[PDB]
A paper describes a structure:
Using limited proteolysis on the cytosolic domain of yeast [name], we determined that [name] consists of a stable core region (aa 43–253) with disordered N-terminal and C-terminal tails. Without these disordered regions, the 25 kDa core was readily amenable to crystallization, and we solved its structure at 1.55 Å resolution. The core consists of 12 α-helices that fold into a compact, curved structure stabilized by a network of hydrophobic interactions. The crystal structure of [name] shows a single domain that we predicted would unfold cooperatively in one step. In order to measure the unfolding of [name] by [name]/[name] with higher throughput, we took advantage of the observation that all of the cysteine residues of [name] reside within the folded core and are inaccessible to solvent. We note that the 42 N-terminal residues of [name] that are not included in the crystal structure can be accommodated in the additional, unfilled density at the contact sites between [name] and [name].
Here we show that [name] inhibits the [name] activity of [name]/[name] because its cytosolic portion is recognized as a substrate, engaged by the pore loops, and completely unfolded by the [name] motor. Based on these findings, the current model is that [name] recruits [name]/[name] to the peroxisomal membrane and directly links it to Pex5/Pex14 and potentially other Pex proteins.
Residue numbers in the entry: 43 to 259
């Protein structure tokens, strides 16, 4: 449609707030529309992933975004089934999780409620990780899987809990998901660099960044 093309054109120009406001104005931010038009959902998730947060937007747009990424709404449950159901598009699954994180991080004010939703997200994500490495064994998106685990560690365990990075976060996840380390050690981003190797290296770099970057400013 012409109106959908207008939204796409705003996205191409990185007028992301205007893109989302137009989607809201025309009624596209709606699970019923998402189910009937996969590319409308794809645009919505991609645009929301670029927004620093959802807090500076108009009230109507904000309420419609929150309905899609608040974990216990009917619309979020349905959207999650659609996005997590396409195991071939792991990078979009990762965008969706980042959008859920953005709601907890910036739209929630009560730390007790933030913790409550963070724990819910942890279960959703760890359950999905098991599904992915089981159902897509032999057909793993190595780069997407590295990104997924690093969202869990750096955005959820570190950022949402306000907790310093540690290799123990990786080993703890592997003890709850015993299939994980074998999978990640056997898949390679490059010669002699497994996903596990890369994640542990990322954790080490993040530790040094956390310790030193502000000192150097």
């Amino acid at each position: 449609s012409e109106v959908f093309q207008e939204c796409v054109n705003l996205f191409i120009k990185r007028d992301i707030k205007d893109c989302l406001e137009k989607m809201s104005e025309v009624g596209f931010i709606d699970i019923t529309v998402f189910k009937s038009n996969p590319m409308i959902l794809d645009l919505f998730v991609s645009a929301c992933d670029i927004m620093p947060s959802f807090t500076k937007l108009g009230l109507t747009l904000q309420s419609e975004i929150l309905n899609i990424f608040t974990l216990d709404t009917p619309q979020c449950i349905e959207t999650r089934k659609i996005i997590l159901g396409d195991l071939s598009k792991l990078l979009v699954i990762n965008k969706f999780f980042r959008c859920c994180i953005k709601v907890i991080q910036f739209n929630l004010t009560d730390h007790t409620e933030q913790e409550e939703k963070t724990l819910e997200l942890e279960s959703i994500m760890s359950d999905f990780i098991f599904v992915y490495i089981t159902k897509m064994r032999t057909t793993i998106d190595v780069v997407g899987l590295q990104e997924l685990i690093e969202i869990f560690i750096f955005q959820v365990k570190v950022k949402l809990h306000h907790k310093k990075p540690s290799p123990n976060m990786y080993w703890a996840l592997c003890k709850t998901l015993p299939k994980l380390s074998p999978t990640l050690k056997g898949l390679y981003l490059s010669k002699d660099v497994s996903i596990e190797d890369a994640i542990l290296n990322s954790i080490d770099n993040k530790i040094q960044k956390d310790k030193l970057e502000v000192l150097f400013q």
